[model samples]
Target: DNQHKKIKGYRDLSQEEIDMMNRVKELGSQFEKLIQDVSDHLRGQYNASLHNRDEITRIANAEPGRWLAIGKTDIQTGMMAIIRAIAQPDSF
Candidate 1:
């Protein structure tokens, strides 16, 4: 699985990563809402339809480099960076 392989490439992810991914997938609707909530707070508007699987995949693909660049920031901050980038492409 290229997805699993890609995940393993960065480092040895702990069990927690799998668990968190599972939970996010399980609570898909809530997770979408949460992303929208954070994006709204940072950007002042929310678009539920825009936070679909494709968008999630796009964010996931970019996340590793973002985390590396914004060293020491928590996952939330990394997510915010992605959201900000999506919201304001010129800013990034």
Candidate 2:
């Protein structure tokens, strides 16, 4: 479910792709910042709120997509990342 930008492993990744991967790997900085920005925008611009992690996961999984509901595969990708991030933070 991990839709890693590099599936074939590091040796075959392009410079830009590798850079992107490394950037996201820094969850504390890059990931937190992105989440903060999104929440800020949602609240300030639309009066929405970013709820607890569980809530977001629920929503992300339930949100409609091309077929009017997010697919299991698409949701699993995010769920798996969350699970890994919790079980093995350093592995990211």
Candidate 3:
């Protein structure tokens, strides 16, 4: 079964933290370029006939975007830890 995970929300985050969050969210230009590079690599592999259409379809349909989703969560988790460090620098 699949499960849903959510990011933790902090109250009264500082202006600098808010700016950092904005920067993270606005990574589209850089992230899109990264995605484009990855897509080009995969497309080249597919074009070389490494896997047939049926196999490609099956793999794509099954667990589509699963790893990318997991990666996003991993990224968010690290960001949360970073935010926590600043959010509660004096915590015991």
Candidate 4:
């Protein structure tokens, strides 16, 4: 008889907040797969260094300056803005 579940804090999350959370969630999935691949390799299942060769090639072929500018624009003060955004979800 455990019926003491009361909802609290942010019943309605902002759409932008939801979007950002989902983006991180998808990124986590990719990294999880990458880690699994590397672990399997270590256990002598897969070969050494399992990675996306095509993605590496595409990244290498792209303009370094253009990619660098995008990173500069997006990541400012080392993810501080994301924390603030979560605190005030409707700021945007």
Model-by-model lDDT, in order? 0.49, 0.48, 0.61, 0.52
| CA deviation > 4 Å runs, candidate 4 | 1-5, 45-92
lDDT for each residue of candidate 3 in 6-55, tens digit (9 for 90 to 100): 33343456889777766665664466567667657656655675559886
Candidate 1 per-residue C-alpha lDDT over 1-92 given as tens digits, one digit per residue, 9 for 90 to 100: 55644532243445765566555445555655665566555333224425577865665665644444344245446555544433333321
Clashes of 3: 0
lDDT tens readout by residue for model 2, 23-73: 545543554465556556544533243556775665566543332223434
Can you tell me which runs of candidate 3 are displaced by over 4 Å?
Answer: 1-10, 50-73, 83-92
User: Which pairs in model 1 have colliding backbones?
Assistant: none
Error of 1 at 62 (Å): 34
- Candidate 3 local Cα displacement, residue 6, angstroms: 16
Candidate 2 Cα errors over 4 Å, as ranges: 1-28, 48-92
Which whole-number lDDT from 0 to 100 does residue 31 have in model 2? 44
Winner by lDDT between candidate 4 and candidate 3: 3
Native-vs-model 1 lDDT?
Answer: 0.49
Instruction: Look at candidate 3 and tell me the lDDT of residue 43.
Output: 64
Q: How many pairs of residues in model 2 come into backbone collision?
A: 0
Q: Which candidate would rank higher by lDDT, 1 or 4?
A: 4
Clashing pairs in 2: none
Q: What is every candidate's alpha-carbon RMSD to the true fold?
A: 16.7, 13.3, 9.1, 11.2
Please give the distance, in angstroms, between residue 24's alpha carbon in candidate 1 and its true position after superposition. 0.4
